[PDB]
Design a protein around this ligand. Structure first.
Ligand SMILES: CCOC(=O)CCc1ccc(S(N)(=O)=O)cc1
Ligand SMILES: CCOC(=O)CCc1ccc(S(N)(=O)=O)cc1
Ligand SMILES: [Zn+2]
Length: 259
């Protein structure tokens, strides 16, 4: 059964024993060295088209919480930038720390943010998510850093439902949530080819990491940290530090959309 996690005994340093691609050639996350990333004029404009997004449910899966979308039609898609074709939004989730000084998966010149949002999309040419994760261009994940400062108004409906999904396996209705309220003003980004950052660690992802972080309040991220990795009735293990550290860049280049 899967028993990977983020503790000492089942965390990122152990994952390779059951998921040997953990030591692969295009693992994520990575450190983004901003001086080494090169501006790429070939990049087409990035198009985040979430007008018709239809959120359904929020789930504590024992590793993070996912806000799930109806991905049965092109209702919420990502296109442009480095991407060929159309990528459909299926879910978003976060990674965060025990303290404000850590939590992000990607780093920027070795700087760790308090958290990182992942909007996960699959390439519609492959028909379903499960087929998409058999392809090197199957997925696109839009990554957004969170820093602690002013509250993010569009995040509060997420924060407020977390009390209802404290433990692993719980879910709640989560309709009519607009993910556009989680974006920063600018869509300036870095991009590189990588992987899922959790097991199974599949090398299918075009990463698009926005340069501009969003600000969330301390009270908002503190409510993340009250979630549990454990199931109901089990000894409490706070859901914190559910991030993988940066992995070797190997034979990759990170491209910037901006000067
Ligand atoms: C009771 C403590 O139990 C353990 O330490 C967990 C065993 C265990 C450790 C790591 C993994 S992995 N390679 O999927 O990350 C699987 C199972
Ligand atoms: C083969 C089935 O695999 C899955 O369900 C993967 C789910 C999954 C989606 C996205 C990510 S992340 N942090 O890289 O955005 C990790 C894991
Ligand atoms: Zn993630």
């Amino acid at each position: 059964s899967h028993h990977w996690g983020y503790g000492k005994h089942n965390g990122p340093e152990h994952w390779h024993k059951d998921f040997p691609i953990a030591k692969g050639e295009r693992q994520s996350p990575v450190d983004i060295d901003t001086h080494t990333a090169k501006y790429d004029p070939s990049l087409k404009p990035l198009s985040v088209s979430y007008d018709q997004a239809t959120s359904l449910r929020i789930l504590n899966n024992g590793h993070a919480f996912n806000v799930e979308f109806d991905d049965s039609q092109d209702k919420a898609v990502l296109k442009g930038g480095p991407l060929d074709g159309t990528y459909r939004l299926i879910q978003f989730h976060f990674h965060w720390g025990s303290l404000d000084g850590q939590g992000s998966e990607h780093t920027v010149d070795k700087k760790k943010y308090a958290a990182e949002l992942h909007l996960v999309h699959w390439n519609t040419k492959y028909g379903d998510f499960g087929k998409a994760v058999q392809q090197p261009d199957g997925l696109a994940v839009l990554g957004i850093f969170l820093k602690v400062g002013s509250a993010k108004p569009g995040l509060q409906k997420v924060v407020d439902v977390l009390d209802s999904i404290k433990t692993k396996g719980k879910s709640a209705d989560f309709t009519n949530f607009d993910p556009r309220g989680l974006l920063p003003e600018s869509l300036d980004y870095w991009t590189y080819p990588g992987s899922l950052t959790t097991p199974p660690l599949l090398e299918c992802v075009t990463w698009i990491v926005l340069k501009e972080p969003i600000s969330v309040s301390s009270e908002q991220v503190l409510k993340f940290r009250k979630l549990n990795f454990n199931g109901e009735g089990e000894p409490e293990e706070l859901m914190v530090d559910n991030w993988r550290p940066a992995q070797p860049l190997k034979n990759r280049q990170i491209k910037a959309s901006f000067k």
